[PDB]
Design an enzyme around this catalytic site. Structure first.
Site, PDB file in Angstrom:
ATOM      1  N   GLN A   1       9.521  49.613   1.496  1.00  0.00           N
ATOM      2  CA  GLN A   1       8.870  49.478   0.202  1.00  0.00           C
ATOM      3  C   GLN A   1       9.740  48.746  -0.814  1.00  0.00           C
ATOM      4  O   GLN A   1       9.226  48.301  -1.846  1.00  0.00           O
ATOM      5  CB  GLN A   1       8.520  50.862  -0.334  1.00  0.00           C
ATOM      6  CG  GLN A   1       9.729  51.720  -0.657  1.00  0.00           C
ATOM      7  CD  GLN A   1       9.339  53.066  -1.228  1.00  0.00           C
ATOM      8  OE1 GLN A   1       9.115  54.024  -0.486  1.00  0.00           O
ATOM      9  NE2 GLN A   1       9.254  53.146  -2.550  1.00  0.00           N
TER      10      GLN A   1
ATOM     11  N   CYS B   1       5.875  54.362  -2.822  1.00  0.00           N
ATOM     12  CA  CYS B   1       5.833  55.245  -1.653  1.00  0.00           C
ATOM     13  C   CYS B   1       4.451  55.862  -1.461  1.00  0.00           C
ATOM     14  O   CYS B   1       3.990  56.049  -0.325  1.00  0.00           O
ATOM     15  CB  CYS B   1       6.878  56.357  -1.803  1.00  0.00           C
ATOM     16  SG  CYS B   1       6.651  57.400  -3.290  1.00  0.00           S
TER      17      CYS B   1
ATOM     18  N   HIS C   1       8.925  61.881  -3.436  1.00  0.00           N
ATOM     19  CA  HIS C   1       8.803  60.754  -2.516  1.00  0.00           C
ATOM     20  C   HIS C   1       7.728  61.091  -1.499  1.00  0.00           C
ATOM     21  O   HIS C   1       7.817  62.115  -0.815  1.00  0.00           O
ATOM     22  CB  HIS C   1      10.151  60.543  -1.824  1.00  0.00           C
ATOM     23  CG  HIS C   1      10.202  59.365  -0.906  1.00  0.00           C
ATOM     24  ND1 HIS C   1       9.891  58.084  -1.313  1.00  0.00           N
ATOM     25  CD2 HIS C   1      10.554  59.271   0.399  1.00  0.00           C
ATOM     26  CE1 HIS C   1      10.040  57.253  -0.297  1.00  0.00           C
ATOM     27  NE2 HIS C   1      10.441  57.947   0.755  1.00  0.00           N
TER      28      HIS C   1
ATOM     29  N   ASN D   1       9.236  57.244   7.338  1.00  0.00           N
ATOM     30  CA  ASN D   1       9.642  56.839   5.997  1.00  0.00           C
ATOM     31  C   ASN D   1       9.371  55.341   5.804  1.00  0.00           C
ATOM     32  O   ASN D   1       9.060  54.610   6.749  1.00  0.00           O
ATOM     33  CB  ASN D   1      11.124  57.178   5.794  1.00  0.00           C
ATOM     34  CG  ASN D   1      11.528  57.288   4.329  1.00  0.00           C
ATOM     35  OD1 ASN D   1      10.715  57.141   3.413  1.00  0.00           O
ATOM     36  ND2 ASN D   1      12.804  57.568   4.107  1.00  0.00           N
TER      37      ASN D   1
HETATM   38  C1  LIG Z   1       7.828  57.489  -4.631  1.00  0.00           C
HETATM   39  C2  LIG Z   1       8.743  56.378  -4.171  1.00  0.00           C
HETATM   40  O1  LIG Z   1       9.883  56.655  -3.735  1.00  0.00           O
HETATM   41  O2  LIG Z   1       8.320  55.207  -4.256  1.00  0.00           O
HETATM   42  C3  LIG Z   1       7.293  57.285  -6.047  1.00  0.00           C
HETATM   43  O3  LIG Z   1       8.350  57.447  -6.979  1.00  0.00           O
HETATM   44  C4  LIG Z   1       6.106  58.207  -6.346  1.00  0.00           C
HETATM   45  O4  LIG Z   1       4.977  57.736  -6.392  1.00  0.00           O
HETATM   46  N1  LIG Z   1       6.351  59.510  -6.568  1.00  0.00           N
HETATM   47  C5  LIG Z   1       5.217  60.339  -6.972  1.00  0.00           C
HETATM   48  C6  LIG Z   1       5.088  60.459  -8.491  1.00  0.00           C
HETATM   49  O5  LIG Z   1       6.049  60.793  -9.192  1.00  0.00           O
HETATM   50  N2  LIG Z   1       3.868  60.226  -8.983  1.00  0.00           N
HETATM   51  C7  LIG Z   1       3.539  60.312 -10.398  1.00  0.00           C
HETATM   52  C8  LIG Z   1       4.074  59.140 -11.204  1.00  0.00           C
HETATM   53  C9  LIG Z   1       3.768  59.283 -12.692  1.00  0.00           C
HETATM   54  C10 LIG Z   1       4.207  58.099 -13.545  1.00  0.00           C
HETATM   55  C11 LIG Z   1       3.774  58.170 -15.003  1.00  0.00           C
HETATM   56  C12 LIG Z   1       3.926  56.844 -15.737  1.00  0.00           C
HETATM   57  C13 LIG Z   1       3.403  56.819 -17.169  1.00  0.00           C
HETATM   58  C14 LIG Z   1       4.233  57.640 -18.132  1.00  0.00           C
HETATM   59  N3  LIG Z   1       3.824  57.536 -19.541  1.00  0.00           N
HETATM   60  C15 LIG Z   1       4.981  61.698  -6.319  1.00  0.00           C
HETATM   61  C16 LIG Z   1       4.345  61.688  -4.923  1.00  0.00           C
HETATM   62  C17 LIG Z   1       5.770  61.684  -4.372  1.00  0.00           C
HETATM   63  C18 LIG Z   1       6.176  62.396  -5.664  1.00  0.00           C
END
Ligand SMILES: *[C@@H](C(=O)O)[C@H](O)C(=O)N[C@H](C(=O)NCCCCCCCCN)C1CCC1
EC number: 3.4.22.2
Length: 212
Positions: A19, A25, A159, A175
């Protein structure tokens, strides 16, 4: 359900992806489950587009993160293109689905595994690859080279990955950090520890696609 499952041995898993620095992810995790269920249902293993989910899932946040559930809902409500039609660019761009012709595959729904329940997750894995989440931020996970991983790690999941098998003492995880990480891109995470979160929080939030 059997003592070992390995969807790679059934020809239901495509090559390991990288990625890159983008927080995509969630899209990679969803795509693994789509590739798997289409093989299981149709007999053909194809690669599908992480980029399309990155660009088009309006509930997610592009390279700032997202949700496997919402990505899977998108494939059920519209569909998804082949990876070759919509290749991975590592940056969020405009949604280009309508420019790229008819969708290649479509699912019928999304289901969630009952959380914090090892047996429920194993049951789902025995049927198909499953999108799961874990805590990957710790250096032990980052530096993993092989073996059945026991941590150290907390349960602060960050993740999304895909569970593609299991054995008596582990769950097998694909992964999205390239083929040079872990066991050719995979990690075996210890199971059976009696901690309801799972090792590294592995039982926190698990989803899979449905296709008739
Ligand atoms: C995972 C990766 O390693 O690429 C990636 O960080 C991820 O999608 N993690 C995920 C998550 O945190 N989802 C919510 C993101 C919210 C962002 C908000 C932005 C706007 C703020 N004002 C989760 C699923 C894995 C943990």
């Amino acid at each position: 359900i059997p003592e070992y499952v390995d969807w790679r041995q059934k020809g239901a898993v495509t090559p390991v992806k990288n990625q890159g620095s983008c927080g995509s992810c969630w899209a990679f995790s969803a795509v693994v489950t789509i590739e798997g269920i289409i093989k299981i249902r149709t007999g053909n293993l194809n690669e599908y587009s992480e980029q399309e989910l990155l660009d088009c899932d309006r509930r997610s946040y592009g390279c700032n993160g997202g949700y496997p559930w919402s990505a899977l809902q998108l494939v059920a409500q519209y569909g998804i293109h082949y990876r070759n039609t919509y290749p991975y660019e590592g940056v969020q761009r405009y949604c280009r689905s309508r420019e790229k012709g008819p969708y290649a595959a479509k699912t019928d729904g999304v289901r969630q595994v009952q959380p914090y329940n090892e047996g429920a997750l194993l049951y789902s894995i025995a049927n198909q690859p499953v999108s799961v989440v874990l805590e990957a931020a710790g250096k032990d996970f980052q530096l993993y080279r092989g073996g059945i991983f026991v941590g150290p790690c907390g349960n602060k999941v960050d993740h999304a990955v895909a569970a593609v098998g299991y054995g008596p003492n582990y769950i097998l995880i694909k992964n999205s950090w390239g083929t040079g990480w872990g066991e050719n891109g995979y990690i075996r995470i210890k199971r059976g520890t009696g901690n309801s979160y799972g090792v590294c929080g592995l039982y926190t939030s698990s989803f899979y696609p449905v296709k008739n």
